[PDB]
Amino acid sequence: AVSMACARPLISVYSEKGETSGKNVTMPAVFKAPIRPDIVNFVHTNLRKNNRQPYAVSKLAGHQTSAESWGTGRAVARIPRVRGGGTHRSGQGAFGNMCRGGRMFAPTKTWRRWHRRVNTTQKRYAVCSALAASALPALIMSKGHRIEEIPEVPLVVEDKVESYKKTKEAVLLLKKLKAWNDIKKVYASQRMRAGKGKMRNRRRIQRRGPCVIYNENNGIIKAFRNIPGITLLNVSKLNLLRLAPGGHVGRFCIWTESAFRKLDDLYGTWRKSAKLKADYNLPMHKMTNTDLTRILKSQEIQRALRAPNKKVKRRELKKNPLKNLRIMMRLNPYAKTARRHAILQQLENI
Amino acid sequence: LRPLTKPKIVKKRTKKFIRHQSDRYVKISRNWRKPRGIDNRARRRFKGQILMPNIGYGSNKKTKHMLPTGFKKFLVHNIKELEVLMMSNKSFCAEIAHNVSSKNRKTIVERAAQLAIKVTNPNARL
Amino acid sequence: SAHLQWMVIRNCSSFIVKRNHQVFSTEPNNLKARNSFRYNGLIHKKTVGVQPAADGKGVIVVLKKRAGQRKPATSYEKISINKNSRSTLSSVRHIIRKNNYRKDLRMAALRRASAILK
Amino acid sequence: RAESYYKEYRQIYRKEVRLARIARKAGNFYVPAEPKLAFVIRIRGINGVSPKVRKVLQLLRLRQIFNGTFVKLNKASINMLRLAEPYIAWGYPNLKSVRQLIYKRGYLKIKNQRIPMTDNSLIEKYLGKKGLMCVEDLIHEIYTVGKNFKAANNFLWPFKLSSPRGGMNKKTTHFVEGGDAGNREDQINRMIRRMN
Amino acid sequence: KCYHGKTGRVYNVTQHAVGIIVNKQLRGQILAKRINVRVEHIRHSKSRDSFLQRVKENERKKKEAKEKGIWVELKRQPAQPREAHFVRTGGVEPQLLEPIPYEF
Amino acid sequence: PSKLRKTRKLRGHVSHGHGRIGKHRKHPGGRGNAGGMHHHRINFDKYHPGYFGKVGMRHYHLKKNQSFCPTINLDKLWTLVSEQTRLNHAKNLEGPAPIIDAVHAGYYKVLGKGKLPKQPVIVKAKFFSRKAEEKIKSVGGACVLVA
Amino acid sequence: GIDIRHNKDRKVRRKEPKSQDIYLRLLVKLYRFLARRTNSSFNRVVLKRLFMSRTNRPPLSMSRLIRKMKLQGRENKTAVVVGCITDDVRIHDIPKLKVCALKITSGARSRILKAGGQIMTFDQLALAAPKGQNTVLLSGPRKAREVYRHFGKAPGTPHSRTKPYVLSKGRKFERARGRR
RNA sequence: CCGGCCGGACCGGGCCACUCGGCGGGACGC
RNA sequence: CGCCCGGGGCCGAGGGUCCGCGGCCUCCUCCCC
RNA sequence: GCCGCGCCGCCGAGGCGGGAGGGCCCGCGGGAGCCGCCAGGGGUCCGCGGCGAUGUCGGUGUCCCACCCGACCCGUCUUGAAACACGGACCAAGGAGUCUAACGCGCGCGCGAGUCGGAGGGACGCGAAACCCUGUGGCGCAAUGAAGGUGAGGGCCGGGGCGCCCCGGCUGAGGUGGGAUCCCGCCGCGCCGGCGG
RNA sequence: CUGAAAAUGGAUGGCGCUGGAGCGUCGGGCCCAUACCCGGCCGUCGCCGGCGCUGGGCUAGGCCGCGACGAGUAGGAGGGCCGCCGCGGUGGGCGCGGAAGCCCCGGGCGAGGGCCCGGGUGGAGCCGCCGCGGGUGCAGAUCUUGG
Ligand SMILES: [Mg+2]
Ligand SMILES: [Mg+2]
Ligand SMILES: [Mg+2]
Ligand SMILES: [Mg+2]
Ligand SMILES: [Mg+2]
Ligand SMILES: [Mg+2]
Ligand SMILES: [Mg+2]
Ligand SMILES: [Mg+2]
Ligand SMILES: [Mg+2]
Ligand SMILES: [Mg+2]
Ligand SMILES: [Mg+2]
Ligand SMILES: [Mg+2]
Ligand SMILES: [Mg+2]
Ligand SMILES: [Mg+2]
Ligand SMILES: [Mg+2]
Ligand SMILES: [Mg+2]
Ligand SMILES: [Mg+2]
Ligand SMILES: [Mg+2]
Ligand SMILES: [Mg+2]
Ligand SMILES: [Mg+2]
Ligand SMILES: [Mg+2]
C-alpha cells in the first residue's frame, strides 16, 4: 500500500581497529523493507531445492530374473517364484515389493521434479526482507550470533579490508570489531553429524558465523576463506540461502563501505527505482506503523473505546429459593411478610 | 524442597490401556491400537472387554503432568538449561538427562542446590 | 517495532527451549526466563536484566539505554548492587518505579534479585 | 405487585367457590371455565419416534425424556397434544406446581443459554418492556395466562425434571386405562411433586 | 393427473387458456411448474377470495376504530377454552342413563 | 511434501479410504474416455455437450499467420503512446493531432468497445470497425488505413 | 438422550486469517481490539474481511473506485478497501481520492498521489476513523472471476448459459451433438 | 530551549560525460 | 417451600456485592449482677 | 333469551362514604451514619487424637496369586460370523496409495491489465547453486458464426420531430425491489438509545 | 381333563413350587440401565463472550468467563510437544567420568500415539527446538526371507 519514506539513521563506517573512521553512510531503504518470514521461508525452501542431485533406483532392480508364478494348487502364495534348480534361490518370490530381493514399490524415477522455479519478484522480495532483518539487533541475537559487543548492528567497515591478502589480517579485524566471539562459537559447534551423513561426505558439522559482504574482490575472498563460519557474498550477487540459513532471517553481516553504497542502487528507494536492475523497486507496506501498543494507546482511539469490562463474573450455585430463606426474599420481597403473617396466624389459631 | 502447592491429584484411571489381544500374541505389543475390525468386540465396546482410551479420561488440567511430589518434570542437559528454572522453582523440578556423564552431573546437582531447584535424580551415577 | 519483531521471534529463536510442554527462553535480559511478549529481553527498547555479579556476592541490574538501540557495545548500562538483601531490593525498586522504566517488570525483578542473593 | 398477586391468587379461588355454592343453592350447576394452562411432560425417549410426533415434541421444546413446558390451551394446541399423547403426560397445574417449577427448576434463556434464575435483574432486563420485573410477575404471567404469556413462557427454559420418585404405573398406556400417558386433569400435580 | 386438485397463481393469460405456477414436490425440491391449461379445468380459489375480504374488513375496522379512538382486534384466535357458565336444570332432574343388556 | 499427504492419516485403516464393499479395483468403468456413448453418456451429454459429431468445414493446411489480426479497443487506444503525448495535445485541441500507429504497437484492427477522450487523434491501422470509426470522427479525429 | 442434530453445530467460518503474514496478523490484532471495544459495526465488518481469502478479497479497479466515489454525498469520505486496488488504464481523470487499502499497485499509487489524493493504511484508518466515520467501505467484484462462469446447472441442460470445461476452443471442440 | 543529521507525490533559485521518454524544452536525480 | 423442627448418606467445584436483620445515632424502667 | 326495577341469598367475590368504641396491623414516618449479625456472589476450623530404624509407614497401576462380577477368535466378505465360512502353529526383519504429465476447485504468495524466461545469453569446495539480461512465445485483455466475416456506452439537460427518433450541451453504465457499511435530521439521555430520510 | 404318536438324556432357564413359586383381578413396598436429576473432571461446539487500562498477568497462535453438548461402520476433515530416515538452521547441545542399541518383579508422565529417568549390558557416536525431503509406523495378504 504505502512506503516508509521516513527519516533513516546515519550508519557509521568503522576502520580496521574497530573505531569510527569519521565517514558515515545513510541507512539504505532496503533495510526498511517489509520483513516477511513467510516469503523468506518460501523462497528458501524452493531455492535450496535447486542444488540437489537426482537419485533413483536402477531400472533392472528386482526384474532381471525369469520368475513365473506356480499358479494355484501348490499350497503356495501365488507369488512369482524363481525357476527350479539346485540353488536356494529356486522357489522364492522375485518381483513383488514384499519379497526379499524383489522390486521396491514405485521405484524412484530420475525424472522426479527436483527443481522449483520462483518468481524473480519473490526472490528479490525475500532478499529485501533478509537484509532488513539483518539490521535489527533482536533478530541477529535470536539467530544466535554473538554481537553483544559489536560497535553497530549494521557493521560497515572501510573498503581497505577488500584488499586484504592474509588470514591473520582478517582474524585481527574480527578481533577489533568484537565479532571474534561468534567465530569462537563456530569452533564450539564443530562436532560430528548424527546419522548416515557421515558415510556420505557429511561427517563434520558446524554453525554459521558472520557474513562478510563486499563489492570488489581485491583479495578479500582469500583472506576470509580459511576462517570457519565466514561467508563471503558479493553485494551484486546476494544469495538468500546464505543470508537466511535454514529459512530463518537475522544473520550477522559485516558490510563494506563500497558494498553499503551500492546496496541502495541494487534495490532503490521507494522514490527512485533500482539503477542496477531493470524495472524493480522495493516492496510496499500494508502497515506503516507496526507498534501495536502505541496505536492503541493513542487518544484518538481511546476516545472511541468503551469502559474496559475488567469485572469477571462466574457461575453461581443457584441455591433453592424454596429451601433457602435469604434467596427467596431476594427474589420476592413480600415472601418475608407472607411467612411472618402465616406463622403469627398459626399461633393465633392455636 | 516443597512445591508452591500440593493439591490432591485425581487420576480417573491408573491401569494402562492394553491393546486388544496383546496377551495372546507376543507379536502384538501392549501399545494401544484402536481396533478397526468389522466384528470386533472391543471396538463395539461390548460389556466385559478391554476399554478404549478416549477423551474424558483426561486428567485435570490443573494437576496434569504433575509428579507425585507436586512439581512438574523438566529435562535439563547443562547448567544453562538448569538456570532457566531459577524462577518458578516452586512449580518445576529439574531432571538431568541420561546421556550426560557423571563428571557433569555433580556440577548440575551442586548448582541446583544453590538455586533451590529440586532434582528428581540427584544421586544417579556418583 | 516490538510487535513486528515479536512475530518473528515468537516461535523461531535460538533461545527458545521447548520441552515437557513448557517454553523457556535463555536470553540474558529475561526475568522470568519465560518466552512471552512482555518478558522477552531483546524485543523492547526498555529491558531490565538482574544478573549475578562477576564475583560470588551482589547482583547486576542491566538497563537498556534509550539511545543505545542499534549499537550493542554501548546499549546496556550495568548497575552493580552489593548491599544487604533489604537494601538491594529497595535499589532495584527505585530504579524501576522512580524512573518509570518497565513498571510491569518491577516485582518480576525483585523476585529474581531475591533468588540470586540466595 | 407480590402482595397484590398474594391477594389476587386467593380471590380467584374464592370467586369460584361462591359461584359454585350459588348454583348448588338453586339446584343448578356451575361449570367452571376450561383450563387455559397445561404442563406437558415428555415421558418417552427418543428411540423410534414417528416424524410427525417427533416434530410436535420439538415445537413443545420437549426434546428429551422428563422435561416440561407450559402450554396455553387452545384448539391449535390441544390438537398438537393429541398427536403426541403416547409420548406426553400433561394436565392442569395449580399455583403451587407453577411456583415450585419456576423457583426450583426455573431457568432462563437469555441468548439460547440456560441461565439460572438468581436475581430479578435478568427477568426485568428481557421482560421489562412487557411489565414483568420480578419472579412473581413471571409466575403471574404463566399461571394466569396474560397478554405476554408467549414471551414469558418462551423465556423459561424447559424444566429438566427428574425421574418420578415412586415410579410410574405404565408408561406405554393411557392414564385412563391405568397408564401414565395422556391427560390427567388435576392429577398432573401429583406427578409434579414426585418429579420436581 | 398430478396437477388435478392442485392450486397455483396465474402468470400468463391467453385466449381461453391461462398459465399457472403450480408447486410440485418431486423428491426434496418443490418445483414451480409453469403449465398451460384451458379455462374449463380451472376455478377461482375461494380461500383466496375469503382472505381478500378479511383484508378489506381489517382495513375498514382499523380505520373505523381510529375515527372513534377505540381499539378493535383483527388477529384471528383459535377456539379458546369455554368460559365459566351456569347450567339450569329447569326443575326437572337429568335423565338417568345406563348400559342396555345384550340382545343376540 | 509427503508429511501432509492423505496416506499418512490412512495408516491403520484397512480399506485406505476406498470402502469395504466396493474395493479399489483397477478400472471398474473402463480406461480414459471409454463408454462416452454407452455407460458414460449421461455424464458426457450433461457436462460436455456437442462432444460427439462433426461440424463445419475442414481446412487442410491452416497457417495461423494469415489470419493474424490482433484487435485493440478505444478505451485502451491511448495506451500505445506516452501520457505526455495525450496531455500536451489536450491543451491545444484545435492544433495538430497526435498520430497513433496501431500496427506498430502490434494491433491490426481497431474496435470500439470503449469511449474516447475528447480530443482529435490520427489513428493508423489496417482494419477499422464501423463503431470504431464513428467514435474517432465524432471526437474530431480521422482514420488512416495502412497496408 | 436428547433429540438434537449435530450436523451443523460447528459453524464453518474464519475466526482468524489463514495467511501467515506478519503485517496482516498485526492489523488483525489491531482490529480485534477495535471490534471488541468499540461498538461500531464498521470495525466488525473490516475485521471479518481481514480473515477472508484472496478470492474473497477481489481487486478494485480505479474506475469502479471512482464511480462509487463520484456518487452523491461522498465528496469528502474515505474509500476503505480490504484488499487490493488495481489501476484502470481506461480512465484519464482522478478526483483526488482518499483511499485506505491493504495493497495498491504501482500504477494506481502513481495516479492517486499525483492527483492530490491520499493513501492510507488500516493502522492509519484506526487513528483517523476509529469507528469508521466518513468511510465508504467498498468491495471488489467477487463473482467476476472466470471460475464462476463454469458454475451453474450444467452445460448440457436447457436454459443453462454455463461455460463447459474444454481443453481447446474451436470448431471441432464440443459443438456438434447437443448444441444443434 | 536548543543545534546538527536524515528521509520526501516539498517550495523557490544555480550546476551536472547525468539520464529520460512514438515531445532545444519537459520530467527524473547529482 | 404452608408453619416449625429433626435425622441419614453423598461433596466444597471456584480462589485479587446483592438481599435480610440487630445495636447505637432517643430518654428511662425491670430482670440478671 | 335480552333490558329495567324490586325482594332475597351470597367466609369476607366485594368495592366506596360516614358513624360508637374496642385492637390487630404498614417497604408511612429509618439513613451519602458508625458497629456487629448472617438460611446472603461454591469450605472452613483462629478444633483434635493415636503411631516412630531392624520392624514398621506410604507407594509398589505395569511381579505373582486369590475370590465376586463381566467375559465365545481375531482379521475378512456379508442382510446376518464365536461359527460345522475363509486366512492365521510361533518370533524376527521386509511388506502395499507412489512418482511424472495434464485438468479442476479450494488455500497461501508475488506482481497486477497485465503476468511468467519455463529456451538461450551475461556476470562470476559449496557454485549443476545463486545474480543479471532477454517477453520470441504462452496464458489473460473480445467475442461470435460452419464459413465468408463482423465485432461490444450508459445516462442526464435543452430544442425539435409527434408515431416509435434527428440536433446541441453536460457528463461517463441505466431503471425496480432488497442490501453489510457510511451520512444527516429530530427525540430521549458531545457521548448513548428511539424513527425520519 | 380327554382328544395329544418319534426317534442321544433334558428343559416354566434351572432347582423346585400345589394355604401357591399356578391362572385372573388389584394394593402397598422394594430391586437397577451407559436413560432422568444434582455434583466433579475431560473434550468439542456456541457466545455480535471478556482482557492491549499493568500479588499474579497478556507464549494475544495467550489468558479468562458462560451455556449447551459427547454412539459410530463405509467415509470425510482437522489437531499431534506421536514415532522413523535424511537436509538447512539452532542449542558456546551430549559423550570413553561411557553414545546408539538391548534387558529390567526400578521410578514416573500423557486420555492415547508414546516419552523421560534409574539400574544392568554395551563400546563410539548421538539428540532437543524452527523449517525442509520421504523408499516413514504392520498381526494378518494359503505375504516374502530367516529362525
Ligand atoms: Mg525379467
Ligand atoms: Mg533389490
Ligand atoms: Mg540411528
Ligand atoms: Mg496412566
Ligand atoms: Mg457387523
Ligand atoms: Mg421402542
Ligand atoms: Mg411400542
Ligand atoms: Mg474409520
Ligand atoms: Mg479390501
Ligand atoms: Mg466402486
Ligand atoms: Mg483407480
Ligand atoms: Mg454352525
Ligand atoms: Mg474365500
Ligand atoms: Mg489354516
Ligand atoms: Mg516391520
Ligand atoms: Mg438498486
Ligand atoms: Mg392339556
Ligand atoms: Mg449436570
Ligand atoms: Mg530413507
Ligand atoms: Mg514402505
Ligand atoms: Mg509380523
XYZ file of N, CA, C and O (backbone and C1' of nucleotides) in Angstrom, chain J residues 81-122:
294
model
P -22.583 -60.405 11.643
O -21.988 -61.868 11.833
C -22.387 -62.677 12.933
C -21.301 -63.637 13.353
C -19.916 -63.019 13.550
O -19.263 -63.653 14.647
C -19.796 -64.740 11.933
P -18.822 -62.788 15.927
O -18.484 -63.880 17.034
C -17.159 -64.041 17.517
C -16.794 -65.499 17.620
C -17.009 -66.317 16.356
O -15.924 -66.209 15.451
C -17.960 -67.449 18.200
P -16.084 -66.702 13.933
O -15.918 -68.282 14.023
C -16.320 -69.122 12.949
C -17.139 -70.293 13.435
C -17.767 -71.141 12.334
O -17.883 -72.487 12.789
C -19.471 -70.203 13.661
P -16.570 -73.378 13.034
O -16.959 -74.801 12.442
C -16.699 -75.122 11.081
C -17.925 -75.656 10.383
C -19.192 -74.816 10.542
O -19.921 -74.823 9.319
C -19.595 -77.017 11.304
P -20.324 -73.436 8.620
O -19.397 -73.367 7.328
C -18.009 -73.093 7.440
C -17.565 -72.094 6.402
C -16.078 -71.787 6.355
O -15.344 -72.755 5.625
C -17.300 -69.767 6.324
P -13.865 -73.173 6.088
O -12.935 -72.026 5.497
C -12.808 -71.836 4.096
C -12.153 -70.515 3.783
C -10.799 -70.279 4.433
O -9.732 -70.884 3.726
C -12.169 -68.386 4.766
P -8.491 -71.521 4.523
O -7.613 -70.262 4.939
C -6.911 -69.506 3.965
C -6.217 -68.326 4.591
C -5.418 -68.625 5.849
O -4.132 -69.149 5.574
C -6.782 -66.738 6.221
P -3.535 -70.339 6.472
O -3.129 -69.623 7.833
C -2.238 -68.520 7.836
C -2.256 -67.800 9.160
C -2.091 -68.670 10.394
O -0.745 -69.027 10.640
C -3.867 -67.155 10.732
P -0.217 -70.494 10.255
O 0.061 -71.186 11.661
C -0.996 -71.448 12.569
C -0.465 -71.855 13.919
C 0.503 -70.872 14.560
O -0.154 -69.831 15.262
C 1.450 -73.028 14.597
P 0.312 -68.307 15.073
O 1.722 -68.240 15.806
C 1.834 -68.491 17.199
C 3.276 -68.538 17.633
C 4.128 -67.347 17.229
O 3.962 -66.230 18.084
C 5.283 -69.341 16.727
P 3.881 -64.748 17.467
O 5.404 -64.302 17.332
C 6.212 -64.118 18.483
C 7.672 -64.013 18.125
C 8.038 -62.951 17.102
O 8.137 -61.653 17.660
C 9.100 -64.982 16.538
P 7.920 -60.358 16.735
O 9.287 -60.220 15.931
C 10.512 -59.982 16.607
C 11.691 -60.159 15.686
C 11.664 -59.333 14.411
O 12.109 -58.003 14.607
C 12.190 -61.568 13.880
P 11.203 -56.769 14.123
O 11.723 -56.463 12.650
C 13.045 -55.996 12.429
C 13.585 -56.463 11.101
C 12.835 -55.988 9.867
O 13.168 -54.668 9.477
C 13.210 -58.302 9.696
P 12.033 -53.692 8.894
O 11.715 -54.284 7.450
C 12.681 -54.233 6.410
C 12.232 -55.016 5.202
C 10.908 -54.593 4.586
O 11.028 -53.473 3.728
C 10.937 -56.936 4.840
P 9.910 -52.321 3.750
O 8.580 -53.058 3.272
C 8.413 -53.462 1.921
C 7.140 -54.250 1.732
C 5.854 -53.542 2.132
O 5.369 -52.672 1.125
C 5.875 -55.713 3.056
P 5.663 -51.096 1.201
O 4.282 -50.423 0.790
C 3.976 -50.172 -0.572
C 2.573 -50.602 -0.911
C 1.469 -49.968 -0.084
O 1.109 -48.675 -0.535
C 1.134 -52.299 -0.175
P 1.222 -47.421 0.458
O 0.662 -46.200 -0.392
C 1.296 -45.790 -1.599
C 0.356 -45.005 -2.477
C -0.236 -43.754 -1.834
O -0.457 -42.760 -2.833
C -1.973 -45.281 -2.346
P 0.099 -41.268 -2.622
O 1.571 -41.312 -3.225
C 2.668 -41.764 -2.445
C 3.756 -42.332 -3.319
C 4.129 -41.491 -4.529
O 5.041 -40.454 -4.209
C 3.814 -43.738 -5.195
P 4.646 -38.919 -4.462
O 5.336 -38.569 -5.852
C 6.744 -38.675 -6.013
C 7.105 -39.219 -7.370
C 6.677 -38.378 -8.561
O 7.556 -37.298 -8.822
C 6.083 -40.630 -8.940
P 6.962 -35.844 -9.161
O 6.737 -35.878 -10.736
C 7.842 -35.925 -11.626
C 7.414 -36.288 -13.024
C 6.318 -35.431 -13.632
O 6.788 -34.195 -14.138
C 5.818 -37.704 -13.995
P 5.834 -32.904 -14.102
O 4.822 -33.142 -15.307
C 5.295 -33.304 -16.635
C 4.188 -33.738 -17.560
C 2.913 -32.916 -17.494
O 2.993 -31.720 -18.248
C 2.368 -35.210 -17.423
P 2.510 -30.329 -17.608
O 0.931 -30.346 -17.809
C 0.368 -30.488 -19.103
C -1.016 -31.082 -19.042
C -2.013 -30.358 -18.156
O -2.570 -29.205 -18.758
C -2.113 -32.661 -17.700
P -3.071 -27.986 -17.839
O -4.458 -28.498 -17.250
C -5.513 -28.875 -18.121
C -6.698 -29.423 -17.368
C -7.180 -28.609 -16.182
O -7.940 -27.477 -16.559
C -7.134 -30.900 -15.608
P -7.923 -26.161 -15.640
O -8.980 -26.485 -14.497
C -10.298 -26.894 -14.826
C -11.010 -27.463 -13.628
C -10.936 -26.631 -12.360
O -11.870 -25.568 -12.352
C -10.470 -28.891 -11.852
P -11.443 -24.121 -11.803
O -11.744 -24.207 -10.243
C -13.040 -24.543 -9.775
C -12.995 -25.099 -8.376
C -12.341 -24.219 -7.327
O -13.186 -23.189 -6.849
C -11.520 -26.419 -7.121
P -12.547 -21.826 -6.289
O -11.925 -22.243 -4.885
C -12.760 -22.673 -3.821
C -11.964 -23.308 -2.711
C -10.842 -22.470 -2.121
O -11.292 -21.491 -1.204
C -10.047 -24.645 -2.537
P -10.597 -20.042 -1.176
O -9.176 -20.308 -0.508
C -9.078 -20.759 0.834
C -7.679 -21.208 1.170
C -6.580 -20.175 0.994
O -6.505 -19.241 2.057
C -5.891 -22.211 0.033
P -6.073 -17.725 1.755
O -4.484 -17.777 1.691
C -3.718 -18.180 2.814
C -2.283 -18.422 2.428
C -1.615 -17.310 1.636
O -1.152 -16.245 2.448
C -1.196 -19.375 0.582
P -1.104 -14.748 1.867
O 0.112 -14.778 0.842
C 1.432 -15.039 1.294
C 2.410 -15.072 0.150
C 2.336 -13.904 -0.817
O 2.968 -12.734 -0.334
C 2.443 -15.915 -2.035
P 2.386 -11.292 -0.733
O 3.084 -10.980 -2.128
C 4.491 -11.087 -2.269
C 4.898 -11.191 -3.716
C 4.291 -10.168 -4.657
O 4.927 -8.906 -4.587
C 4.168 -12.311 -5.638
P 4.050 -7.580 -4.366
O 3.689 -7.109 -5.844
C 4.710 -6.724 -6.750
C 4.378 -7.127 -8.164
C 3.182 -6.435 -8.796
O 3.472 -5.136 -9.279
C 3.030 -8.751 -9.186
P 2.395 -3.958 -9.105
O 1.176 -4.404 -10.028
C 1.324 -4.491 -11.438
C 0.197 -5.270 -12.067
C -1.175 -4.618 -12.020
O -1.355 -3.661 -13.049
C -1.345 -6.886 -11.362
P -2.508 -2.550 -12.936
O -3.634 -3.058 -13.943
C -3.688 -2.580 -15.283
C -3.005 -3.523 -16.240
C -3.129 -3.161 -17.719
O -1.945 -3.568 -18.403
C -4.050 -5.296 -17.357
P -0.614 -2.671 -18.331
O 0.131 -3.191 -17.023
C 0.846 -4.417 -17.024
C 0.047 -5.525 -16.387
C 0.835 -6.745 -15.941
O 1.463 -6.568 -14.685
C -1.048 -7.447 -17.167
P 3.038 -6.833 -14.523
O 3.144 -8.405 -14.308
C 2.311 -9.074 -13.374
C 2.151 -10.525 -13.741
C 3.437 -11.250 -14.102
O 4.157 -11.694 -12.967
C 1.812 -11.685 -15.752
P 5.750 -11.507 -12.904
O 6.316 -12.835 -13.574
C 6.062 -14.103 -12.994
C 6.227 -15.214 -13.998
C 7.563 -15.272 -14.718
O 8.586 -15.873 -13.944
C 5.812 -15.524 -16.284
P 10.006 -15.141 -13.771
O 10.967 -15.913 -14.779
C 10.897 -15.677 -16.181
C 11.313 -16.892 -16.973
C 12.785 -17.273 -16.847
O 12.922 -18.691 -16.923
C 12.282 -16.796 -19.106
P 13.715 -19.484 -15.772
O 13.505 -21.017 -16.143
C 12.292 -21.678 -15.806
C 11.910 -22.703 -16.843
C 12.325 -22.360 -18.268
O 12.605 -23.562 -18.984
C 9.965 -22.485 -18.140
P 14.126 -23.962 -19.307
O 14.271 -23.711 -20.871
C 15.548 -23.496 -21.450
C 15.473 -23.404 -22.952
C 16.759 -22.989 -23.647
O 17.673 -24.057 -23.817
C 14.985 -21.689 -24.477
P 19.064 -24.062 -23.011
O 19.804 -22.740 -23.502
C 20.215 -22.595 -24.854
C 20.281 -21.146 -25.265
C 21.383 -20.315 -24.628
O 22.641 -20.495 -25.254
C 19.346 -19.127 -24.531
P 23.999 -20.336 -24.410
O 24.120 -18.767 -24.163
C 24.274 -17.868 -25.251
C 24.045 -16.438 -24.830
C 25.006 -15.883 -23.791
O 26.244 -15.471 -24.340
C 22.801 -15.353 -23.164
P 27.592 -15.620 -23.481
O 27.462 -14.498 -22.358
C 27.345 -13.127 -22.710
C 27.103 -12.260 -21.501
C 28.097 -12.412 -20.362
O 29.298 -11.695 -20.590
C 25.895 -12.401 -19.499
